[PDB]
Amino acid sequence: VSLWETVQKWREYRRQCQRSLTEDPPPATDLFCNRTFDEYACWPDGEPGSFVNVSCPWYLPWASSVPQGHVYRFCTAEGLWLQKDNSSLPWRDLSECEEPEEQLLFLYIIYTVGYALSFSALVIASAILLGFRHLHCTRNYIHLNLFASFILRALSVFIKDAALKWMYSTAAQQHQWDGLLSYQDSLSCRLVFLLMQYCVAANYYWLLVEGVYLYTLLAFSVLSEQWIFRLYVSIGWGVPLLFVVPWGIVKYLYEDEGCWTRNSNMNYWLIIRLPILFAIGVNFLIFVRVICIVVSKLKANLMCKTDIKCRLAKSTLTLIPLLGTHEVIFAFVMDEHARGTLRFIKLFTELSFTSFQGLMVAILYCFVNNEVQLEFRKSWERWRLE
Amino acid sequence: HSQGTFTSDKSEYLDSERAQDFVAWLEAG
Amino acid sequence: ASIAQARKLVEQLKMEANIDRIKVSKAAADLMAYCEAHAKEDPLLTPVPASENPFR
Amino acid sequence: TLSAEDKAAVERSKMIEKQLQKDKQVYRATHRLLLLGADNSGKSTIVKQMRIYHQQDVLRTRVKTSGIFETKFQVDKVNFHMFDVGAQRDERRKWIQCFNDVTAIIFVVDSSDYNRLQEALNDFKSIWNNRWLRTISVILFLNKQDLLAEKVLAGKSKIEDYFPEFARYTTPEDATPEPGEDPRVTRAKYFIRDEFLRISTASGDGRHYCYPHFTCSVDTENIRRVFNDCRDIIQRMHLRQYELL
Amino acid sequence: QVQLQESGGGLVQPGGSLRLSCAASGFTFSNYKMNWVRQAPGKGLEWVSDISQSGASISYTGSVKGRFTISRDNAKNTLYLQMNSLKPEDTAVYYCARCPAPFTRDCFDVTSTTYAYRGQGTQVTV
Amino acid sequence: ELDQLRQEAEQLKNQIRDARKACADATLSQITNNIDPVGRIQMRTRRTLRGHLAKIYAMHWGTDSRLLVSASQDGKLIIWDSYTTNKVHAIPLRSSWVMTCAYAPSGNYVACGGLDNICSIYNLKTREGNVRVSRELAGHTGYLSCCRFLDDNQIVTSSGDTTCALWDIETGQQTTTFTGHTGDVMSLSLAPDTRLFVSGACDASAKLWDVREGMCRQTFTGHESDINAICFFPNGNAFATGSDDATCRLFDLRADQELMTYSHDNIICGITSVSFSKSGRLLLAGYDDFNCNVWDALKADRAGVLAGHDNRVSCLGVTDDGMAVATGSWDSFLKIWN
């Protein structure tokens, strides 16, 4: 079941006609019965006054579901079958041979919006941080790298969707059946998708170094900051490659399918799914031992006004976007099993959130962060002395 | 990772559509 | 002791309170002469052209 | 040879920069404290027992001067510096500005001499509200706990004489007293602690805190207590940058 | 320079309801914190009471509470220190204290040995 | 007798007040409010020196208007080069608490001091091409506040024990000691002819000293709080004081009375540093509001703001030729303006 597959099966069906042109049936004694060399069978004319019946094609997928059917045509001595017009629309019965994705449209309209909003907010945030001199620090360097990993994710997501149209019915909207296979059998489409399997992994691993960093400021004494940053920038931007490039090798060593977009072999998909899940699990662990500490400093806050219920509730919803804690909910359990609405729910509950994650990590950790607010007021007031 | 799964899904349904249209452009066309 | 030091300071204060004290008009005139005497030499008053200074 | 001379100078500037880069990681890997007390508060003795935690150099004794720094004492593989001010004048409202970026301030109170207890109370209030010493937390040490016992046990006590608020004081329920102590001594021990704590309640809002402790003259857990308090102080500061507190 | 003057002290019959008033000049009186410091014979300096900038916050030394009063008066530029129920240990010298920095709630060196902005002092006896 | 001495002191004070009143005829500002002002003056940073870790307390320009030395609480002494922002020397300090520094007129020595009561002098003409503490000075019983070189073999120091003294570099003893102050002396400035100098202490009063004999020629009052900084007019006959009462005043040695009272309404911060200019017309000062307002001499109206510092400003200085103006604050940064 594949366009490419069936194009070559029609090249074989025309090779069949080439082999059938090699053995043609003799005509009858009349005007004609023009069946000549059609797009199905290649058998010329015949004896009319009979129910001329030729079997069903095999390359047709709609016909594999019903092999019992075939074509029904009653040739007559006049030269054709049964029609009101001459050589226009004949008597045929292909109904015997040839035997609803709404969600997709819905889903796609939602996340193409979250990612756009994120990208906008994140380029604004990154510009603000890179602007002021005062706030140049290790924490904000990590924040900028995480921002830049969300901007690289959005881009690839955008471009990838364009590719789908080009190699499918958007270019097949015209009469270029050939153009889709050439562009599909090229080496420029292949690159395009293998460029995505890296941006997603890099975003995941940068969320993972935002939590491992956060974790060592409390756990134990810090060391050479110079060395620390060099090791961190190597994990977030290069550990993805260590399992993305092997995945590209496997896809371009054996599978070699349509621009590496269909996870046919679920074992090769695990090459990417496993490190992502590892990063998500470490991020979730880093999120549970930081909330203990926060409740052990509020509950034990000397005088301690009992309000931990509305004070630590606002200190959990600010850590969720930074460490990407929402991914551990559905993804950790199911993956290639749910074949029901469960799958749809899973799909819907992740795409939606992840697309809008960037926007939130840009507000809470930059726009609303009071320190960044001091850059503005001071400068604004500075500028106000003229 | 829920992004490659949407990509895969869209691709397999979409691909199939084009195949039967190829057929109706020949046999039925 | 404290008493001896106080007496010494008193004897010192007495002679440190009888010095010439002219009117403030002469001091103001001298300040005027000094301030418009070198008013064109200080670069903070009249900046030099920004073509030969070492801060280009 | 303009380039040649410029190159000599540039090379020099790069040398005197590598040394600064090396010293930056040493400056930021140590903690500076400030210990100040009273003339009769056991201050000295405490400084002397941190020595046990830390031609060549042997018992370096210089001239009688100010700023007597201790033995660069260290615990649990982290270095601590403590600066005991001495040989100075009575007034301290001007040189106190130097210690505006220290990790913590150690305060020692002689809670055995009732007479001057109230005069020691003021100094803590004055240091608490200072504009420069406004984001610096203070560690409280109540020294000479042994001598307190005797007092309340002898005759001439009258601890409510200079403090007539003790009359209605009841022991807090949360107070965990030491197993094998006396009710009278538990009342006196905890009645001074919250005296200092009430001053710390004003101008609070989490900017800085105060940590009370019941220390003794020959206690050996001081360096531990200081390490734990500094660790608690550092962790709270980091959390405030991530808006978690 | 800055001069602080106090009066009302002296020898008087016990229970005389003494009067202690501080006179200030050479600086703005509405911009500084006023304290009270006492020096009993045979020992060092002692702190008694303080008042806020506008007279709102009031504190007392534990030993003497509910027997003394303080009242800052900007218009008359005086202080009210009426007192009663004398004790034999109340015989001492009272010094009118000041605060070096303005626009601040606390300041050191009120009981220092050689402070500058401190009154000359008056002698009282029961 | 105490009582006897009370009347004598009161009579002396009354006589001094009457003598001051007799010499006063009219105010300078009201009688000369006709000349045009200097306008609004704006500067912008040209160089930004970095490298210091902790805050900065003092700095001093050289005699060539090209080299300057700065001291910081991190324990390092650094000699800069304003032309190319290239460091030359980096001398570690014996003690990490430093509050003052100085530069020799011949460019051969420096000085430092702080909480430790010893003053250290370093040589920069060494044969080994390094630096070495040559002499150290001891004898003070209080933290040093300021020190300025007088020549290759004399120096003047100020300490917190209400005393000032003059030392000898070749052999270290107090050649002369000046006493009479009540509070702690905070700053001093030598005259251009090195014949007299003034010093303000924590008693709202200033004094004038003679380096030769040692007698206190004159004394001036008027402020209502501690004196934090003091400068010296280029002509050699005036000086300015900046106190913690958010006011600035000017004094004249011959007039013996204050002339200008630079103040405002919305500023409540103590002065930290004071310096003049080449023309004796643009007075610069520091503040706790993280700014450095340029006030004037006869104008008396902030005609320039040096905003750009994010922390307290502690040191300030100007070159001998006036071409450049430097500054330093508690953020461990230096700026140069024009």
The full set of domain ranges for chain A reads 102-384
Extract the tokens encoding F63.
């005699």
Handedness of CA D8, D9, D12, D17 (dihedral sign): negative
The 10 Å Cβ neighbour count of residue A292 is: 9
Residues B18 and A172 sit within 8 Å (Cβ to Cβ)? yes
Of F39, F37, F38, F42, residue with least CA distance to F292: F42
Rounded to 5°, the CA angle F317-F318-F321 comes to: 160
Gap between the Cα atoms of A166 and A176, Å rounded:
11
Contact E100/F at CB under 8 A: yes
C23–F25 C-beta distance less than 8 A: yes
Question: At residue A126, what are phi and psi to the nearest 5 degrees?
Answer: -60, -40
CATH code: domain of residue F103: 2.130.10.10
Neighbours of C (≥3 Cβ pairs closer than 8 A)?
Answer: F
From the options 3.40.640.10, 1.20.1070.10, 2.30.30.60, 3.40.50.300, give the CATH code of D31-239: 3.40.50.300
Give the CA dihedral D236, A211, A126, A314, nearest 10 degrees. -60
- Distance, in Å, from the CA atom of F19 to the CA atom of D171, rounded to the nearest integer, reads 68
How many whole angstroms separate alpha carbon F299 and alpha carbon A225? 51
Please give the Cα distance from A314 to A326 (Å, whole number).
16
CB atoms within 10 A of CB A306: 9
List the one residue out of F220, F173, F217, F177 whose CA is nearest residue F201: F220
CA distance C8 to chain F (A): 11
Q: How far apart are CA D104 and CA D209, in angstroms?
A: 10
DSSP-derived letter for residue A173 is T
Contact between D107 and D36 under an 8 Å Cβ cutoff? The reply is yes
Task: Name the 3-class secondary structure at B28.
Answer: coil
What residue of D is the nearest CA neighbor of A322? Answer: D242
Of F84, F115, F118, the CB nearest to D98: F115
Per DSSP, what are the bridge partners of residue D80?
D31
User: Of the candidates A127, A126, A118, which has an alpha carbon nearest to the alpha carbon of residue A145?
Assistant: A126
Q: Range of C38's domain?
A: 1-56
The C-alpha atoms of residue A222 and residue D28 are separated, in whole angstroms, by 10
Tell me if there are at least 3 CB pairs under 8 Å linking chains F and C: yes
Is residue F54 within 8 angstroms of chain D, CB to CB? yes
Instruction: Look at D239 and A297 and tell me if their CB atoms are within 8 Å.
Output: yes
From A218, A224, A370, residue closest to D238, measured CB to CB: A218
Contact F224 E2 (CB under 8 A): yes
Chain E within 8 Å of F288 (Cβ-Cβ)? no
User: What phi and psi values does residue A149 have, to the nearest 5 degrees?
Assistant: -90, -15
Task: For residues D137 and D29, give the distance between their C-alpha atoms in angstroms, rounded to a whole number.
Answer: 20
Is D95 at the interface with chain F, CB within 8 A? yes
Q: What angle do CA F205, F206, F207 make, to 5 degrees?
A: 135
Residues of chain F neighbouring C34 (CB-CB closer than 8 A): 234-235, 280
Question: Distances from the Cα of A340 to the Cαs of A126, A262, A334, A347, in angstroms?
Answer: 41, 19, 12, 11
Query: E strand or H helix at C4, and its extent?
Result: helix C2-15
User: With 0-12 CB in 10 A as exposed, 13-18 as middle and 19+ as buried, what is A60?
Assistant: buried
Quickly tell me which residue has 């990154």 as its tokens: A126
d(CA F184, CA F163): 8
Asked if the Cβ–Cβ distance from D24 to F161 is below 8 Å, we say: no
Chains that touch A (3 or more CB pairs under 8 A): B, D, F
Nearest of E81, E74, E95, E90 to residue E30 by alpha carbon: E74
Contact state of F225 with E101 under an 8 Å Cβ cutoff: yes
- Closest Cα of chain E to F147: distance in Å? 25
Residue F113, chain D, CB below 8 Å: the answer is: no
Instruction: Pull the structure tokens for residue D30.
Output: 């140590």
Q: How far is CA A214 from the centre of its chain?
A: 31
Which residues in chain A are contacts of B15 at CB distance < 8 A? 1-3, 168, 258
E-interface mutation test, from F7, F161, F225, most E Cβ less than 10 A away:
F225
Helix axes A138-166, A225-250, angle to 10 degrees: 20
Nearest chain E Cα to F206, which residue?
E1
Across the interface, whether the CB atoms of F203 and E103 are under 8 A apart is answered no
**How far is the C-alpha of A50 from the C-alpha of F98, rounded, in Å?**
118
Breaks, C-N > 2.5 A, in chain A lie after: 99
Burial group, residue C50, by CB count within 10 angstroms (0-12, 13-18, 19+)? exposed
For tokens 């009143």, the residue is F21
Contacts of F76 in chain D (CB under 8 A): 20, 23
Q: Which of F310, F331, F332, F335 to mutate to test the interface with A (most CBs of A within 10 A)?
A: F310
> Strand F163-168 vs strand F154-159: parallel, antiparallel, or unpaired?
antiparallel
Three-class SS state of A374: helix
A3–B15: do the CB atoms touch at under 8 Å?
A: yes
What kind and span of H or E run contains D34? strand D30-36
Q: Is residue D9 within 8 angstroms of chain F, CB to CB?
A: yes
Nearest to C45 among F16, F237, F281 (CB): F281
Question: Which of F19, F254, F278 has the CB atom closest to C27's CB atom?
Answer: F254
F85: closest CA of chain A, how far (Å): 19
Whole-number Å distance between alpha carbons of D188 and E25: 46
User: What does the DSSP 8-state code read for residue E118?
Assistant: B
For residue D234, the distance in angstroms to the closest alpha carbon of chain F comes to 19
In CATH, what is the architecture of A102-384?
Up-down Bundle (1.20)
Domains of chain D, by residue range, sit at: 31-239
Cα–Cα distance, D9 to A283 (Å, whole number): 49
Instruction: Using DSSP bridges, classify how beta strands D30-36 and D78-84 pair: parallel, antiparallel or unpaired.
Output: parallel
What's the N-to-C CA distance of chain D in angstroms?
A: 60
When divided into structural domains, chain F yields a total of 1
Beta strands in chain A (DSSP E): 50-52, 73-75
Look at the block and give the residue holding tokens 């809470």: A364
**Shortest CA distance to A7 belongs to which of B7, B29, B11, B25?**
B25
Write the residue in A1, A160, A351 that is nearest to B2 by C-beta: A351
Looking at CA atoms only, how far is residue B2 from chain A in angstroms? 6
Kindly determine whether residue F307 and residue A382, on different chains, have CB atoms separated by under 8 Å. yes
Which amino acid does the sequence have at A382?
R
Residue F335 burial by Cβ neighbours in a 10 Å radius (0-12, 13-18, 19+):
buried
Contact E2 F204 (CB under 8 A): yes
Q: Both tokens of residue A112?
A: 């193409």
Please give the Cα distance from C24 to F26 (Å, whole number). Answer: 8
Contact E20, E9 (CB under 8 A): yes
| Pick from D90, D162, D163: CB nearest E114 | D90
Closest CA to F307 of F324, F289, F319: F289
Pairing mode of beta strands F294-296, D78-84: unpaired
Estimate the share of chain D in helix, then strand, then coil, as percent rounded to the nearest 5.
40, 15, 45
Neighbours of F6 (CB within 10 A): 11
CA distance A41 to A16: 9
Q: Which residue has the tokens 């001594």?
A: D185
Q: Which CATH architecture has domain E3-124?
A: Sandwich (2.60)
Q: What is the DSSP letter of F71?
A: E
Listed by number, the residues of chain A in 214-273 with a beta carbon closer than 8 Å to a beta carbon of chain D are 214, 217-218, 221, 224-226
Q: Are A308 and A347 in contact (CB under 8 A)?
A: no
SS3 state at F116: coil
CB contact under 8 A, A134 and F307: no
The length of chain F is: 338
Q: Which domain holds residue F180?
A: 2-337
Q: Residues, chain E, total?
A: 126
C-beta atoms of D92 and E107 within 8 A = no
Category of D72 on φ-ψ map: left (φ > 0), alpha (ψ -120 to 50) or beta: left
CB F109 within 8 A of CB F120: no
CB F119 within 8 A of CB D48: no
Contact F307 A385 (CB under 8 A): yes
Q: Quick check: F141 and D20 CB within 8 A?
A: no
Provide the token pair at E37.
Answer: 């410091």
Q: Which residues of F97-123 are buried (b: 16+ CB within 10 A; e: fewer)?
A: bbbbbbbbeeeebbbbbbbbbbbbbbb
